[PDB]
């Protein structure tokens, strides 16, 4: 079973090709995950120059297989059960009073390395809004990620709302709609309803001259008493 591939530290690679309101950009990331603790450590670089959207708006798009599932909940971990063959993760993200992101990613192992490769298209954004106007604070808050089974697709449906703090003291909500489906045909685990308690912290490498984001994440599954 795929869960056995996550008992230690796993190297990660991320690639993102994006187009938001016609502004094209690419991001690469690398780091490692440790699902025993639920911990991710990643550094991302915009390889095309200046990122045309705020880094926080890309956090959810840029590997929930690294969540820590407590022992009594391990039968509800769809993400690892799809490994190594992987899963497709698709989202629509609605920024309140602004545009939307559409994303499609494949998350899979290539040997020892967990790879997340993504395409993102954004449209309908306001040129002077919080996103294209870079008005988001460089930080992140805690969120609960709600998961339910999708039997007809042999996968899961996921929903949550991200709170992005704005420089003027307001909050910009981002409504996330997500589906995950296995790439392979082997047996997977379909979960009872539960959620992922997710925390993220964003920083900078003072020696990095490129536009970049250092990201640490702690994620633990919860919501099932036993």
């Amino acid at each position: 079973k795929g869960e056995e591939l996550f008992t230690g530290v796993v190297p990660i690679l991320v690639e993102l090709d994006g187009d938001v309101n016609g502004h094209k950009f690419s991001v690469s990331g690398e780091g490692e995950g440790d699902a025993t603790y639920g911990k991710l450590t990643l550094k991302f670089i915009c390889t095309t120059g200046k990122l045309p959207v705020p880094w926080p708006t890309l956090v959810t798009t840029l590997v929930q297989c690294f969540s820590r599932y407590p022992d009594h909940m391990k039968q509800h971990d769809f993400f690892k059960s799809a490994m190594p063959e992987g899963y497709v993760q698709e989202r629509t993200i609605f920024f309140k009073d602004d545009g939307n992101y559409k994303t499609r990613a494949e998350v899979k192992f290539e040997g020892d390395t967990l790879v997340n490769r993504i395409e993102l298209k954004g449209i309908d954004f306001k040129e002077d809004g919080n996103i294209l106007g870079h008005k988001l604070e460089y930080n992140y808050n805690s969120h609960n990620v709600y998961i339910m089974a999708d039997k007809q697709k042999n996968g899961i449906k996921v929903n949550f709302k991200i709170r992005h703090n704005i420089e003027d003291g307001s909050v910009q909500l981002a409504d996330h709609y997500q589906q995950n489906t296995p790439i392979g045909d082997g047996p997977v685990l379909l979960p009872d309803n539960h959620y992922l308690s997710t925390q993220s912290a964003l920083s900078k490498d003072p020696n990095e001259k490129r536009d970049h984001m250092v990201l640490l994440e702690f994620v633990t599954a919860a919501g099932i008493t036993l």
């Binding site: 039968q75 047996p187 379909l190 009872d192």
Partner: protein
């Protein structure tokens, strides 16, 4: 004696859930001619669940699980799996896997006395 059987997969689920069991056979697996699953509920005898012929993979399902359970096997990996869909509380039991090396006619595969080797079982509970 010649063949060791190790079942896995049992756990607590709720009525309507699916659950997949597996059994790994080792030792002198060249001689296997059929494998099967039985189950023993509290206070009941061991009950036939499913059998599979080893070379061709022909399957036999017990009347009370027919249509909801599927048995399959992998000769190269020497495994046999039991896919259990639409589980019910009455499916709660210890599930045992068994193996035969003697040849047979199909009618005998339903009998607990027709198998040469047995595993230790795995507990399935359906609320």
């Amino acid at each position: 004696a010649q063949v060791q059987l190790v079942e896995s997969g049992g756990r607590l689920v709720q009525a309507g859930d699916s659950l997949r069991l597996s059994c790994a056979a080792s030792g002198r697996t060249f001689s296997t001619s059929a494998m099967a699953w039985f189950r023993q509920a509290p206070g009941r005898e061991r009950e036939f669940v499913a059998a599979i012929t080893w070379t061709v993979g022909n399957t036999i399902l017990g009347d009370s699980v027919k249509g909801r359970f599927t048995i399959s096997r992998d000769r190269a990996k020497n495994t046999v799996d039991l896919q259990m869909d639409n589980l019910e509380p009455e499916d709660t039991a210890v599930y045992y896997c068994s193996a035969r090396s003697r040849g047979y006619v199909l009618s005998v595969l339903r009998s607990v006395d027709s198998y040469d080797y047995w595993g230790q079982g795995t507990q399935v509970t359906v609320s």
